[PDB]
Amino acid sequence: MEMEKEFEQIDKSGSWAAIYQDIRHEASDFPCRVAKLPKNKNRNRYRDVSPFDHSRIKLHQEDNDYINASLIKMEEAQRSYILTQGPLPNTCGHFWEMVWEQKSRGVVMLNRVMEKGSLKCAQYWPQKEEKEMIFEDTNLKLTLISEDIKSYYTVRQLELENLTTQETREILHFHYTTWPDFGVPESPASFLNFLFKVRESGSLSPEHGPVVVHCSAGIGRSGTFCLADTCLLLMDKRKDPSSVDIKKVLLEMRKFRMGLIQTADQLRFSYLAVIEGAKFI
Numbered sequence: 065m066e067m068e069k070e071f072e073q074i075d076k077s078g079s080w081a082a083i084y085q086d087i088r089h090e091a092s093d094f095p096c097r098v099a100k101l102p103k104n105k106n107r108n109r110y111r112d113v114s115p116f117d118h119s120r121i122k123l124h125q126e127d128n129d130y131i132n133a134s135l136i137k138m139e140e141a142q143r144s145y146i147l148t149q150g151p152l153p154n155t156c157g158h159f160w161e162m163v164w165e166q167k168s169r170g171v172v173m174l175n176r177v178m179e180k181g182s183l184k185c186a187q188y189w190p191q192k193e194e195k196e197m198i199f200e201d202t203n204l205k206l207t208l209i210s211e212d213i214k215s216y217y218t219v220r221q222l223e224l225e226n227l228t229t230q231e232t233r234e235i236l237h238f239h240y241t242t243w244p245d246f247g248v249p250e251s252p253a254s255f256l257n258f259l260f261k262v263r264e265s266g267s268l269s270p271e272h273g274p275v276v277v278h279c280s281a282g283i284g285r286s287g288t289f290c291l292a293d294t295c296l297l298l299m300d301k302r303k304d305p306s307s308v309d310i311k312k313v314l315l316e317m318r319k320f321r322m323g324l325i326q327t328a329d330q331l332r333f334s335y336l337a338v339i340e341g342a343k344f345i
């Protein structure tokens with residue numbers, strides 16, 4: 065509405081880089097003491113990307129409680145997300161332990177396991193029904209039950225079993241497989257369609273634990289996903305939907321995890337997706 069006006073003005077004046085640097089300058093700075101402990105060195109994919117102490121997810125088993133994951137609790141929008149890095153070869157057991165303990169129903173993945181020929185994420189789920197995965201450190205079993213492969217995303221039905229109790233849960237794995245190798249998508253149409261499939265699945269419902277969202281570092285594409293979803297919720301809720309200030313929403317989210325939205329292009333894309341998604345809804 066007025067957001068498109070703001071959008072057109074920022075585009076005309078060429079000042080995406082300036083707004084984005086404003087956001088980085090104003091962003092919260094909280095301690096990450098646990099993440100920086102020497103014993104957690106091999107639990108972090110990027111030494112530059114750490115969860116704050118106050119919002120980090122704690123693992124419940126009797127062992128190091130640390131995972132590079134953050135609870136983003138958006139109070140006005142009434143939605144929570146867990147943003148986490150792409151699991152490492154030694155943290156896949158921790159990752160699925162977190163899904164179990166936080167009672168998540170959905171996992172949202174926004175990268176390919178390899179992009180531009182570099183690994184962005186471990187192969188943390190089974191690709192073949194008959195070759196399940198067992199995480200012996202956290203005593204979990206993970207089985208591919210079925211998958212629905214579409215042109216721009218794949219949804220998988222995963223069965224997660226707590227081998228200690230033999231309880232099982234169905235986990236929906238929403239994998240956006242078509243984010244460009246460089247830059248952001250030209251159009252937000254398929255990203256938005258993906259978002260709405262996630263919403264339609266029930267995975268974002270408050271009857272479940274928070275959805276787990278990740279890319280490689282869990283702040284860039286992941287940030288775009290949560291930012292767009294939250295702003296669209298706020299535009300549906302508020303009496304004056306044009307009062308939704310994307311920059312303020314993103315600063316609120318950065319109180320919970322550093323670095324959300326890593327480039328001015330990703331900031332522009334977030335505006336574009338919220339503008340188009342609002343029109344849709």
Ligand SMILES: [Cl-]
Nearest residue numbers: 101102103104
């Ligand atoms: Cl230590």
Ligand SMILES: [Cl-]
Nearest residue numbers: 175176177178
């Ligand atoms: Cl992949």
Ligand SMILES: [Cl-]
Nearest residue numbers: 152183185186
């Ligand atoms: Cl890896």
Ligand SMILES: [Cl-]
Nearest residue numbers: 214215216217
């Ligand atoms: Cl399709």
Ligand SMILES: [Cl-]
Nearest residue numbers: 247327329330
């Ligand atoms: Cl980018």
Ligand SMILES: [Cl-]
Nearest residue numbers: 263264268297
């Ligand atoms: Cl929703």
Ligand SMILES: [Cl-]
Nearest residue numbers: 175279280281
């Ligand atoms: Cl990524």
Ligand SMILES: [Cl-]
Nearest residue numbers: 307308309312
């Ligand atoms: Cl706002």
Ligand SMILES: [Cl-]
Nearest residue numbers: 088323324326
């Ligand atoms: Cl940043």
